[PDB]
Every structure is written in C-alpha cells, then in structure tokens.
Symmetry: D3
Subunit: 150 residues, 6 copies
C-alpha cells in the first residue's frame, strides 16, 4: 500500500539529484501506482530553470513518471524485495504521447498516476498523468524492459 | 494581499538557494499573523548529509524557515509589497528561545509554518509559533529577527 | 546570421543556466530548417551522482531536453536572428513530446550531437524532430513541439 | 586532539551538514572545545546572502549541537566507531540563544560546550561560539542519541 | 594490459571522485612509456559557476590535475596492470610540478586531451611530462613527479 | 587588511573557485600575506578523497595565483572595483612547485607571495603556502595583466 522514502531507496537505484519520487500512496500489483514528488525552491534544478522564474522541467515530470512505472513493475514481479532490487534494471525504451498543460512550480505536490497498459514478457508498457491539486498537468506513455543488472 | 507565490517571496526575502526555505505563503494579516509552507523532498542537497540512508530535514532549518516566514511578514508589514525597497534589505537573527522538536520531518512532508507577532518595534520583530505537517505540530519556536539595510 | 555559435553566444540566446543548459556548441544552422548542435558528456557533472552510483548513464530525458534547447535556439534565431536584447524577453515552453526511442546509452566521454529539423512552425509554435548521435550512431530519436512565450 | 577523520567515525552527519572540523579539548561528562573553519568556498554562502556572506546563525547552533553530540557519544561509550555507526542524533530543544557578532568567511568558529544535565541518551548542553576570543553566540540545547 | 579504458575502468583504478575526477576515457596506453586520455568540457560543470560568471574558462590548474591523474593511471597500471583490488590500497601523490605553460583557454564544447609520457621511473617514483591538447593544438604543457604511496 | 567583501570587488572569481578568504598583509610591488580557511564543508572533499579529505595541491597553487594576482592589481591601481572589471590577470606559467605537507579540514591555509620581478604588465611572483608556521607548498608564477575583452 504505502511506501516511504526509506522503502523507495531500497528498490530504486536512483539517487540525488535524480530520485524524483518521495512517497507511494497507492500500489496495486499489475494494475496501477499513485505516487508523488514534492516541488520546492530548494532544489538545484531551479538555479537554471529558470533564473527569476522557477519552473520544474517537463522532462523531469516524465522521468518521475518513469520512476513510478518502474517501481510498479518491480513490486508487481517481486514485491518489496531490496535484495532482488539490486540485481535488476528497468531500461526505458520509448516515451510517447506526452503533453504538458500546466507548469509545475515550487510549492506543488506532483502526483504521478500510472497504470499498466501492456505487460508481455520482459516488456512493460505503462501510461497515465501527473497531477497537481486534482488537475492534469502532464500525460505520457512509457515502455520499459526488465533485465539483469551487470 | 494574502496569498503569495515563489515569485513574490523571491522579490521580498533576500535569501537565495540553498537558504530560501519558504515556497508559498497561504495567509497573512499585516502586523499580526502569517501562515506559509515549504515542501520537503528527497531532491534537496541537505539530505546527502542528514543523514545518509535516513533523510531527516534538520530542525535548525525548520527554525530558519519559520524565521523567513516572520521576515516576510515583517517586511510587508513595514513597507507593504515593495521589491525595490526589499532588494537592499537583509535579515539577522537576534535570539532563539523555547524551541521544541516533536516529530521528525521527512521527504514528502508539506512543512507548514504558522507565525504570530509577539512584539515588534521598528526593525525588530519577535515572532512565535509552530511548524506543522498534516495538521500536527512538529516544532515550536520563539525568535527575534532584525531587518537591516545592506551596507 | 552565422552557422557556428559558441557557449558565450548560447548564453545570450537561451534563458537556461546551470544545471539545465545542456547545449555547449552549435556547429550548423539553417534558418527555419535545421540545426546541428552538441553537448559534451563528462563524469564531472552532478547528475551522475544519482544516475547511477558506480554506473554513470546520461539520463534519456535530458537527451530530449538537449534536443529541445537546440530546437529553441533554432526557433529564436530564425525569427529574430542573434538578438540578446529580445532574447531576454522570452522563455521556451515544452508543449508535447512524441516518438522518442532510446537505442544506445550515453556515458562520460561521449560527444552528444543533436540533429533537429523543423517539421512545422507558425508564429511562436515550433515543431522539431530528429536524432541524438554519438560517433555517427543514432543514440536516440524524438519529436517535440515548443512555444516561445513572453516572459511577462 | 580529534581530527576530521575521527569526527567522521563518531558523528553520523555528512556533507553539507557536518559542521565541526576539529576537536581541541574533551573532558568526559564535563566539556568540549571544538571548531569549524568558515571559508567563502561553502555552498551556503550562495544564498546567505548574495553579495554579503554571513554564516547562518542556525548553523552555528547546529555546530554547537554536533560538538555536544561528540561529547555525548564519547562520555557514553568512549571512542568506539562500531557502536557510533548504528546511531543518529535528534534535536529535542533549543533555548536561550543570542547572536552577538556575524560570522564571516575567514573566521575560525570555536565551539565551547559544557554539559548541564544528562540521563541515558538525553543530553542537555550549553555554552558559546567564539571567534578570536570573543563570544559571537550563546545557546542551550538538548539532544537525543537514537538507533 | 589494454590500451583503451572507459569510465568504469578509470573508477576502479583512480580514487578520485566527483568533483575531482577529471579523466573520462583513455584512448591509448603503453606501459612505462605513455598515456593518451581525455576529459570532455561541458557548461554543465559546477566549476564554471565561479570561473567565470558569463565567461566559462576551464581552470588551468585543473588541466594540470587531469594530466596528473592520467600520469598516475599510467604509473599504477605500468606496475600492476589492471588490478582494482590493489588500486584500492594505493594512492598517487604529486610531489612536484614544473615548466607549466598555458597557451590557449579551454572552454565548454572542448575535448581536453592529455598526452603524458614517462621521463623517468625507478620504483614508486615517477616523472612524467606532456601536453593538454584541443583539436591537435597544445593548450597547456607540464612536468610532474609523482609518488605511489600507501593509502593507509 | 582586506576582507571577503573587498576581495569580491577585485577578483572576478566566484563560488566554487574563489580560494582566498582574507588579506592580512599587503606591500605594493613587494608582498602579500593572505589565507583561505579549510573546512570539511567544501564540495571538493566529496571526491578528494572519500573517507580521506585532502585539499588538492593544484588548488593550493590556485589560491597562491589569486593572491599574486590581487597583489599585482592593487600595486598598480589600488582598491579600485571599477578598474578591476576592465582588467584580467592571466597566468602564463607556473614553475618550481613542491608539495610538502597535506592540507586538511581545520587548517588555515596561508599564502605568502613576493614580487620576484615585474616589467610592464608581466608580473612574476613566488613564495609558499603555510599552515601553522610550516611550509606546506612552494611555487613560482608568472602573470600577465590585460584588458577585459
Ligand atoms: O529506471 C530505472 C533505470 C534503471 C537502470 C539502471 C542501470 C542502467 O544502466 C540503466 C537503467 O534501473 C531501474 C531499476 C528499477 O528497479 C526501477 C527503475 O525505474 C530503474
Ligand atoms: O583567466 C583567464 C585566462 C585566460 C587565458 C588566456 C590565455 C591563455 O593562454 C590561457 C588562459 O583567458 C581569460 C579570459 C577572460 O576574459 C578572463 C579570464 O580570467 C581569463
Ligand atoms: Cl519544461
Ligand atoms: Cl535534527
Ligand atoms: Cl535514462
Ligand atoms: Cl543569521
Ligand atoms: Cl585558469
Ligand atoms: Cl593533491
């Protein structure tokens, strides 16, 4: 059900400054994940994107959505297993149908909504939205391959 | 006004990265009250050190963000919303008292600052209040700050 | 309007700064048609601290971002030429991304070359598509639409 | 003296939140004298403040707390890196802090803490931060060592 | 012993890490004789924030450092080959630097290539000299004496 | 005696490449004593080295160069922020560098440079880096002062 930052750190190999999921609030094996990242001015990205106009990069929304899809794929296959997590990679192959509707700024709670669209063998296809305060700010479709870490 | 966004905070507070610790102001009554917040996320540089494998937003930075909330209240109460006057101001801590930390603050928390003015005279502002996550009190603090022209 | 632009020229046109300016040099530029630019990939980038420990891989989403910034440089110089005065009144906004493929991973020591062509443009709305290349091999592909908006 | 390498074996804090450089005096259950060098080459000065570098008062207090923590760790268990690696430090209270003089790059920030009261993992310390023999800050604080 | 080494191999031999690992790839290596390596220069390096604002110049002393790290890689591997287990126990300290000359500024977009050659070696003591080059032009030259020391 | 705020007005260097914190002594055309405080709370120590913080020797030499540049500039033009923005101190050569003692967090890294010779805009300086009386490094440096492009 609920996974906190300690739990996310044991499953995802991502680390600062590229770990872009703070908490998982809903997880349904093989179906869907609801997760989020808090947006704050005290992030390094905002030094350059943009000076005097802080806007969370669209591509990092898509990345945070990828990280949520990967956590869902992994936990669907093995559950919360830190030991197996160390031996796996989720390689993202394609990104499709992404639209940005509302900018994301410091003070926003950026909620990733992702569902499994297609799972066939090692290939996972996941899609959904990013939301701030019940409003769709971004949508994206993503495809990933599960493999062994080397 | 009563709601201020990061663009407005940037125009009033002299603090910048990595020491600007208020993201949004939800309410303020001039000379009286401020409610504001900072989002807590793993994607902050402090967490590299505090602590490895166990991210805990430092208590001293909760106090700092509370102080910055008081200083936004202080400036706008003195001169209103005036970025041109603001640009040459700084803020100094004078005192800190009666602080208690109750609950650890972690990534994914929305850290809400509630400050009330206890006493103010000219540039010297004494504020007290709480920091809250999900309606619970995580920290209490009393502090005195001075607004000063940069020289 | 010249065809080669260096970092000091890019600074004057793009509003992006560290750690989000991901184009180092422009090597080729045809107004309203095409741009070739590149970013040098080095271990000495903060991003590699997290992506990943002991295994530095330049993030795919940042390759796309680099392609966008290349497109936004093309878009702006096409409409205003090299004009830093007017460049300061603008910001680039991502509208859509589609058809992105990640074929080969990008690592420290790579010269990440961005090849973009204008697919459609009207006013501030620019639609570009192309590839990211390392040593003449297609490392990634993407199409994106952007808008140059008044900074307000 | 305990040097940075020894401090790293006892305190769990790391960059950019390790704010003690060297321990010059240690007396078990009594006092500690330690310092941190202040240099322009620290990331905090980018924001505090632009064009006027002033070491944050709250980080003076943090440094004092970390000094207190080192005194707490060692009075409890001595110099034992193995036990230390299990623990972290939690701030419980801060009280009676007064800042008198701004701390700036080029300053040697000296921490003087004595123990006021202690019980189990709970340590109450108080004292001053000093630059060149002058008191720049006073503080009292209570900390807890936790698994 | 190979002649080509990538970032995974450099990380296993050198103890340097961010922001002080200043070699990205080794293109040529001859034991006890020479190394050719490079570092990519990108705007996306923190060093450029302060050297200098609006005028990114790669610090000359960091060109020297990258040359030294290349030399230390050559030194270690000349003696033990590619031995990560032993590298973890050794550290190369530079004792002297001489005849440093800076000829051309190094900027974002540049491929900073280190050409080091062994002038003298007895045991743990190594004297190296050479150049940093960009586009086959010499941007810096230096001589250095290093020491293979214990890490503990 | 110059403080960081004075230093910031003369040197174009900013974070993380301004490596002088205070000027304690300055004789025009003659010498400078200056220092940089060394602390664990510096970004360089993340990689130089993990579990063993050692201030890079090339950065010691950089701090010496910055001190030597400050000496040359103020010798000619004094404390002049306006003229400073129109001038560049460009280092051409470095020679006779020796590293004797490692510099660590907690050290006050003191730079002692004298003018060896000068002719026009070409200035040669040299001296030591010292920690608590001991010589930790020596170096000679030649700089050219030029107009900001
Ligand atoms: O997005 C991910 C990327 C990777 C990854 C790790 C190493 C690579 O060389 C390439 C990709 O591993 C993962 C492992 C996971 O369990 C989950 C992920 O989302 C990822
Ligand atoms: O420090 C500087 C050094 C150089 C430089 C100039 C000539 C060289 O052979 C090597 C380096 O150019 C510069 C140009 C500037 O506009 C500013 C500088 O500080 C520098
Ligand atoms: Cl964007
Ligand atoms: Cl704390
Ligand atoms: Cl990726
Ligand atoms: Cl303060
Ligand atoms: Cl330089
Ligand atoms: Cl060194």
């Amino acid at each position: 059900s609920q996974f906190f930052i300690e739990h996310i750190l044991q499953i995802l190999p991502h680390r600062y400054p590229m770990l872009l999921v703070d908490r998982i609030t809903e997880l349904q094996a093989n179906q869907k994940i609801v997760a989020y990242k808090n947006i704050t001015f005290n992030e390094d990205v905002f030094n350059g994107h943009f000076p005097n106009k802080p806007i969370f990069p669209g591509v990092l929304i898509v990345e945070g959505m990828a990280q949520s899809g990967g956590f869902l794929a992994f936990t669907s296959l093995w559950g919360f297993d830190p030991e197996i997590a160390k031996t796996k990679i989720v390689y993202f192959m394609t990104i499709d149908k992404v639209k940005f509707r509302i900018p994301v700024t410091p003070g926003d709670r950026l909620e990733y909504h992702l569902e499994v669209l297609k799972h066939k063998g090692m290939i996972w296809q996941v899609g959904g939205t990013a939301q701030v305060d019940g409003k769709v700010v971004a949508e994206a479709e993503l495809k990933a391959m599960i493999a062994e870490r080397e």
